[PDB]
């Protein structure tokens, strides 16, 4: 249930707009390789899987404080969001670091499995843990399912969490929880495969509406707005054959209005 | 039954949910969600697959609030559904064969099947076989008395999805000539290198009403959900392959309907 929603406030001061860029968290193996992950290991048996922290991309998130409008109670209601991945043309650099596609050719473009996801809500994004291999020892500095069992590889209802920390929740361990998130709208698409091509579209004319069937958007509890993202673009193949995840930042522009509640 | 007016008044609507586990074969206690490794090149005359190698349809029966003690039935109106755990395929460091020397592990890919159903009766199925001479193992329910026409259309191969982890996906499909009280949706994509493509959002809803505006009517206050979500093949370092499946979520909205 939550709160009982009343009328929408009108007036020139009844609308506000917030924007932000959300950095990607791919692992950052050293101070020069911001936006990349550590090179990927392979063929570790399920019984001895223990990835390094700098190899694991994580969800990005930020809490945006909104103007205090109570100064009947009011809440900021998120109505629309414009969002976009920043820096897609940087993958047209094929002269740096990447393995040549063949003798005398250019570098190999970033390609492979990718995941593009964003969420807007008045609460932190609620997440459900699912694991490829429950026996994985995840490293210090990450937050992954507690007390994992073999059912963590399908559905273990004890693996609930709030996306409440940045660069902490590995993407491979968590997904948005459809059984919750009453105060959040989320959108994501996964495409896996060695040769999956990145496909990214930019325009400042597209808007996603955040209202539900009753015309209510996410209501910002404690005057805070939550943005979340994960934009793994694919793998970068170095000249030696090693591979690293590559991520890019995401822009948000959210329009909000004042809404009466009881 | 003869369908009358929709009842109104707060207590007239209800909303139920459940997570439905995949039944991929589960070769041992640690590999829940996977199948046994796949055999190959067995001649049609001696095709004899093991049970743990065969993915099966998932199904469950969700009890609804009792209505009768002026007959009423629960009518499913909408469903929100989603495959759970799609980002776990971003683990390329465990168990999977390297794409090349010094590279990362090979992603899960290949043939996949994604299917769900919501109804007031058990999903009704029709059997079709790749090879009618296949000897299906103990523990599975497959077409009885298969013949060569089982490979195209044998109308005797009718079944209800009335048991979990027992009807192999490769043997059965939703029966379009029946299922008057069920809505089903499925998409098959086949091939070695087929990339998995999975979308998640809590903003999409499927309406279950038919042309007359009637949704599935729940017999005996029992709502049926069914699913099959084979995501592709996992390639181990040695080259062996296993199916990988994922669970599916349901949130169904229902209302009280008068019937005569």
């Amino acid at each position: 249930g939550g709160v009982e929603v009343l009328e929408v406030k009108t007036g020139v001061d009844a609308i506000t707009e917030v924007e932000c860029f959300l950095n990607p968290e791919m692992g950052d193996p050293d101070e020069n390789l911001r936006g990349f992950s550590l090179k990927l290991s392979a063929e570790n048996d399920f019984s001895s899987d223990s990835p390094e922290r700098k190899m694991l991309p994580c969800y990005s998130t930020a809490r945006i404080p909104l103007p205090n409008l109570n100064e009947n109670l009011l809440m900021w209601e998120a109505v629309t969001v414009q969002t976009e991945v920043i820096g897609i043309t940087s993958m047209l650099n094929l002269h740096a670091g990447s393995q040549k596609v063949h003798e005398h050719g250019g570098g190999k473009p970033i390609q492979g499995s990718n995941f593009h996801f964003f969420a807007v809500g008045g609460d932190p994004l609620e997440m459900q843990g699912v694991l490829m291999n429950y026996r994985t020892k995840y490293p210090e500095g990450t937050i992954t399912p507690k007390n994992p069992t073999a059912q963590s590889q399908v559905m273990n209802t004890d693996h609930k969490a709030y996306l409440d920390k940045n660069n902490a929740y590995p993407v491979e361990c968590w997904i948005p929880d459809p059984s919750r998130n009453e105060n959040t709208r989320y959108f994501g698409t996964f495409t896996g495969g060695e040769n999956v091509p990145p496909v990214l579209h930019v325009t400042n004319t597209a808007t996603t509406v955040l209202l539900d069937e009753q015309g209510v958007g996410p209501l910002c509890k404690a005057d805070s707005l939550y943005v979340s993202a994960a934009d793994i673009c694919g793998l970068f193949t170095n000249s030696s054959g090693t591979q690293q995840w590559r991520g890019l930042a995401r822009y948000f522009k959210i329009r909000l209005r004042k809404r009466s509640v009881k | 039954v003869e369908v009358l007016e929709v009842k109104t008044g707060v207590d007239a609507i209800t909303e139920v949910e459940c997570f439905l586990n995949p039944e991929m074969g589960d070769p041992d206690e640690n590999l829940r969600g996977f199948s046994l490794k796949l055999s190959a090149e067995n001649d049609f005359s001696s095709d004899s697959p093991e049970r743990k190698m065969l993915p099966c349809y998932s199904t469950a029966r969700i009890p609804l609030p009792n209505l009768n003690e002026n007959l009423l039935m629960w009518e499913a109106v909408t469903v929100q559904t989603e495959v759970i755990g799609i980002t776990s395929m971003l683990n390329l460091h465990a168990g999977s064969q390297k794409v090349h020397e010094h590279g990362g592990g090979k992603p899960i890919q290949g043939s996949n099947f994604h299917f769900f159903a919501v109804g007031g009766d058990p999903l009704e199925m029709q059997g079709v076989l790749m090879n009618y001479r296949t000897k299906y193992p103990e523990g599975t329910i497959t077409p009885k008395n298969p013949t060569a026409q089982s490979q195209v259309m044998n109308t005797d191969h009718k079944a209800y999805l009335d048991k979990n982890n027992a009807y192999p996906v490769e043997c059965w499909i939703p029966d379009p000539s029946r299922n008057e009280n069920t809505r089903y949706f499925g998409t098959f994509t086949g091939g070695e290198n087929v990339p998995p493509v999975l979308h998640v959002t809590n903003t999409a809803t499927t309406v279950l009403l038919d042309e007359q505006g009637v949704g599935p009517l729940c017999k005996a206050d029992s709502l049926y959900v069914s699913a099959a979500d084979i995501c592709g093949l996992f390639t181990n370092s040695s080259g062996t392959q296993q199916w990988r499946g994922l669970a599916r979520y349901f949130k169904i909205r229902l209302r009280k309907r008068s019937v005569k």
Partner: single-chain antibody, 225 residues
């Protein structure tokens, strides 16, 4: 605050049955896994069985699977272990332990134990250290760095205490003098500014799978007094 009381231990004829009880108080019982650990007289600790918060998942060590049945009553804050077909190899003090710190089944709070009489990881047996000096206790195994390690301290005639969980993390109330590291094929516990109280038996535990919670034999650390 937290209190655990085991009961039910007595003499049992081989092939007989016995039912152990553990009364829990001082914490939210239904929020944590519970574990049974046994220790034969003069030997080390052995993981026997554990159970999920709501009891929907149960796991057993091989030697007792089929004979023992673990259960819990969250309305009464009680944990139970039903032992059938008891063999002489089952003779041990049985501990009741909570699963609070970390992700990989470390054991935080232990009871006083109850005695039942029926009738992989390499540790050095002994280590000596001077007071104020620094002592190292090692735990060895194949690719132990790939698995999580927990370290426990047990003073003679007392219940075990968890000093390090998930390789390097120290619980609240444990001094920074105790330190843990795990790499390669050896995990090491380091005790610095050694004090008289530090003298005890020290155990390493590894989580490899749901039924595999191996303990080490243990090392006696003796402070020159």
């Amino acid at each position: 605050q937290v209190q655990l009381v085991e009961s039910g231990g007595t003499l049992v004829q081989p092939g007989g049955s016995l039912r152990l009880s553990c009364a829990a108080s001082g914490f939210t019982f239904n929020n944590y896994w519970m574990t049974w650990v046994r220790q034969a007289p003069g030997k080390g600790l052995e993981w026997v069985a554990n159970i999920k918060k709501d009891g929907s998942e149960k796991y057993y060590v091989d030697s007792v699977r089929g004979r023992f049945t673990i259960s819990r009553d969250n309305a009464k804050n009680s944990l139970f272990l039903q032992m059938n077909s008891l063999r002489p190899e089952d003779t041990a003090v049985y501990f009741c332990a909570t699963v609070r710190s970390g992700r990989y089944f470390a054991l935080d709070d232990w009871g006083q134990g109850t005695l039942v009489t029926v009738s992989v990881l390499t540790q050095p047996p002994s280590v000596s250290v001077a007071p104020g000096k620094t002592a190292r206790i090692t735990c060895g195994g194949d690719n132990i760095g790939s698995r999580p390690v927990h370290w426990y301290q047990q003073k003679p005639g007392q219940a075990p205490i968890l000093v390090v969980y998930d390789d390097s993390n120290r619980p609240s109330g444990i001094p920074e003098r105790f330190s843990g590291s795990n790499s390669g094929n050896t995990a090491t516990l380091t005790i610095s500014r050694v004090e008289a109280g530090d003298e005890a038996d020290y155990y390493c535990q590894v989580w490899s799978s749901s039924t595999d919670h191996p303990f080490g034999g243990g090392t006696k650390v003796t402070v020159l007094h």
